[PDB]
Ligand binder design. Structure first.
Ligand SMILES: CCCC(=O)O[C@H](CO[C@@H](O)CCC)COP(=O)(O)O[C@@H]1[C@H](O)[C@H](OP(=O)(O)O)[C@@H](O)[C@H](OP(=O)(O)O)[C@H]1O
Length: 514
C-alpha cells in the first residue's frame, strides 16, 4: 500500500491513482501521488524496495502545469513542483484520469497555506516530546555563562516592551556606564534602532563582539555625540584599552551607496579610536542569484567536463569564502588582538548575523556542543531578528519575492565547512545541519517562523508549536558526532580559501541515486 505515513495532526487532502513520477536518474515509474497538509508523498509498488518520494510541502516554491491539450507526447501532460532544496519534481497525469487539476489545486492550497488563509502545519503538529526545545535558551543565563553582567557591562530592560528596538530581543547588554535615555538616543542614529549591543565577551581579555545596524550618517556627515560616546564606552571596557575595530560586512561601494540613501558608515573623523574595515560581502540579491546559478549546474545532471569553471561562474564558494574570511578576521582581532569589535551591515540582521555567529563559533567551544549550537541559533539568529519568514517565504505563493535569500543556508554551509576542516571540534554531525536545513523549509516546527522575537511572542509559538530542538534533543544519537570531545585547542581557525573550501555535496547534490 502506497498511503503516506501520517504525523499526528497530518491528513490526506487529495490522492491520485496512476500518476507517473519522472525520476531524472531512474526514468519513470507509475504510482500513487498523495497530498497532505504537510507533505507530497509519491509511492510506486511497480518497483522493489517500493519507490518512495516524500517531500515536505514547505519546500515547494512553484507549481507549474506541464503540457496541455495540444500535448500529444508521452508523459507530456502533468505537473512540476520547483523546490527550495535543490531539485524540481515532475509527474505525468493522464488527461482522462482527471487528477491533474485536483492535485494542482490542492498543492497550491496546502503548500501555500498562508496565501490561502490556512495555518502552517506547525500549528497543527500535535506530537509530544520529552524535552521542550522552547526552554533551551535563556538570555539571562547565557549572559551569565559569559560572566555577564559584570562591572563593565550591565543589562538594561529598556527594550522589554520592544520600544527601543522592535527587531531586537527583550534583554540587551550595554556598557555599564551608558544610561537608558542615552541608549534611547543611539537608537535614533542607528538604522531601525538596532543599536550596538553585546553578543560575546572574551572570558579573559574582556574584548567584545557587539552588533548593530548602519549609522544614519546620510549624504551630509551627520554625527551622534552619544553614538560616538557609546563606541568609546565599548573601548574603555577593554582592560588592555587598545582602540576599537568596526567590521562593516559590506563592500565599499555598497556602504557608500547606502550613505547616499541616508545610511552610511563610521568615518575616521567621527569615530577616532575606531578602525573601520569593509568585508566585501554582497547583499541578499546577489546571494539569491548565486544560489540560482548553482542549482542549475547541480540539478539533474552535472556537466563534468566543465564542473570547476561552471562552479566558479556561480560565485557560490566565493561568497562562502568571503563570509568565513570575514568571521575569521573578527575572531582573530578579538582572540589574538585582544581588541573589541563592532559588527554591522546595513540593517544588521543578515550579514551581521552570519559574522557574529561564525566568529563566536571559532572562539567559544560552548557553541560547538549540539545544545550550544541550538542556543547560538536562538540567540544570534532568532532573538536578534533575522527575518526568517520573509527570507524563506513560508507558505507564501509569491516565489518571485525579492526578499527571499539563502542567508541562513550560507551560514549553515559555512558551519559545515568548519566541521570538514575540524572533524572532532563539533559535537553535532552533518545530519544535524542537513536536518536543520530541511526543517528551515518544512514549517513542521515553529522554530524558524516569524521575523522577530516580538512577533513570536505575540504569536505564542512556544505554546502553539513544537520546537525543532524538542525533536532533535529527544534523539541526540542521530545527530551526535562520535569523534567529538578532543578539541582541547579551543580557538578554531579554518582556512578561507578556494583550495580549502568544497561544495557541500551532502546538501546540494543529495538527490542522485548514485
Ligand atoms: C539608506 C539605504 C538603506 C539600504 O539598506 O539601502 C540599499 C538599497 O538601495 C537600492 O536598492 C535603492 C537605492 C536607491 C540596500 O543596501 P544593501 O546593503 O545593498 O542591501 C540590504 C542588506 O542585504 C540587508 O541585510 P544586512 O545589511 O543586515 O546584511 C537586507 O535586509 C536589505 O533588504 P530588506 O530588509 O529591505 O529586505 C537589503 O536591501
Amino acid at each position: 500500500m502506497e498511503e503516506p505515513p501520517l504525523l499526528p495532526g497530518e491528513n490526506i487532502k487529495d490522492m491520485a491513482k496512476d500518476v507517473t513520477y519522472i525520476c531524472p536518474f531512474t526514468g519513470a515509474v507509475r504510482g500513487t501521488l498523495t497530498v497532505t497538509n504537510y507533505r507530497l508523498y509519491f509511492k510506486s509498488m511497480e518497483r522493489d524496495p517500493p519507490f518512495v518520494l516524500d517531500a515536505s510541502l514547505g519546500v515547494i516554491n512553484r507549481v507549474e502545469k506541464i503540457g496541455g491539450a495540444s500535448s500529444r507526447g508521452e508523459n507530456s501532460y502533468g505537473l512540476e513542483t520547483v523546490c527550495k532544496d535543490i531539485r524540481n519534481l515532475r509527474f505525468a497525469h493522464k488527461p482522462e484520469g482527471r487528477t491533474r487539476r485536483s492535485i494542482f489545486e490542492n498543492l497550491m492550497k496546502y503548500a501555500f497555506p498562508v496565501s490561502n488563509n490556512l495555518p502552517l502545519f506547525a500549528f497543527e503538529y500535535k506530537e509530544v516530546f520529552p524535552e521542550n526545545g522552547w526552554k533551551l535558551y535563556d538570555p539571562l543565563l547565557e549572559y551569565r555563562r559569559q560572566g555577564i553582567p559584570n562591572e563593565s557591562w550591565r543589562i538594561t530592560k529598556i527594550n522589554e516592551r520592544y520600544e527601543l528596538c522592535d527587531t531586537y530581543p527583550a534583554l540587551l547588554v550595554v556598557p555599564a556606564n551608558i544610561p537608558d535615555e542615552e541608549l534611547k538616543r543611539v537608537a535614533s542614529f542607528r538604522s531601525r534602532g538596532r543599536i550596538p549591543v553585546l553578543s560575546w565577551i572574551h572570558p579573559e581579555s574582556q574584548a567584545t563582539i557587539t552588533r548593530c545596524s548602519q549609522p544614519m550618517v546620510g549624504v551630509s556627515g551627520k554625527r551622534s555625540k552619544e553614538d560616538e560616546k557609546y563606541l568609546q564606552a565599548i573601548m574603555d571596557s577593554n582592560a588592555q584599552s587598545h582602540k576599537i575595530f568596526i567590521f562593516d560586512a559590506r563592500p565599499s561601494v555598497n556602504a557608500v551607496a547606502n550613505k547616499a540613501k541616508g545610511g552610511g558608515y563610521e568615518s575616521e573623523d567621527a569615530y577616532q579610536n575606531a578602525e573601520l574595515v569593509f568585508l566585501d560581502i554582497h547583499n541578499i540579491h546577489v546571494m539569491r542569484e548565486s544560489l540560482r546559478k548553482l542549482k542549475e549546474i547541480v540539478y539533474p545532471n552535472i556537466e563534468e567536463t566543465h564542473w570547476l569553471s561552471n562552479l566558479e561562474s556561480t560565485h557560490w564558494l566565493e561568497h562562502i569564502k568571503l563570509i568565513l574570511a570575514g568571521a575569521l578576521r573578527i575572531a582573530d582581532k578579538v582572540e589574538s588582538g585582544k581588541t573589541s569589535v563592532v559588527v554591522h551591515s546595513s540593517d544588521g540582521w543578515d550579514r551581521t548575523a552570519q559574522l557574529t555567529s561564525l566568529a563566536m563559533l571559532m572562539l567559544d567551544g560552548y557553541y560547538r556542543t549540539i545544545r550550544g549550537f541550538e542556543v547560538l541559533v536562538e540567540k544570534e539568529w532568532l532573538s536578534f531578528g533575522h527575518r526568517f519568514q520573509l527570507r524563506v517565504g513560508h507558505g507564501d505563493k509569491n516565489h518571485a519575492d525579492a526578499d527571499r535569500s539563502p542567508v541562513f543556508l550560507q551560514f549553515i554551509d559555512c558551519v559545515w565547512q568548519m566541521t570538514r576542516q575540524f572533524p572532532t571540534a563539533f559535537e553535532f554531525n552533518e545530519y544535524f545541519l542537513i536536518t536543520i536545513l530541511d526543517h528551515l523549509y518544512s514549517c513542521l516546527f515553529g522554530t524558524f517562523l516569524c521575523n522577530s522575537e516580538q512577533q513570536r511572542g505575540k504569536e505564542n509559538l512556544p505554546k502553539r508549536t513544537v520546537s525543532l530542538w524538542s525533536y532533535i534533543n529527544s534523539q541526540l544519537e542521530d545527530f551526535t558526532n562520535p569523534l567529538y570531545g578532543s578539541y582541547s585547542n579551543h580557538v578554531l581557525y579554518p582556512v578561507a580559501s578556494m583550495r580549502h573550501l568544497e561544495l557541500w555535496v551532502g546538501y546540494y547534490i543529495r538527490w542522485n541515486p548514485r
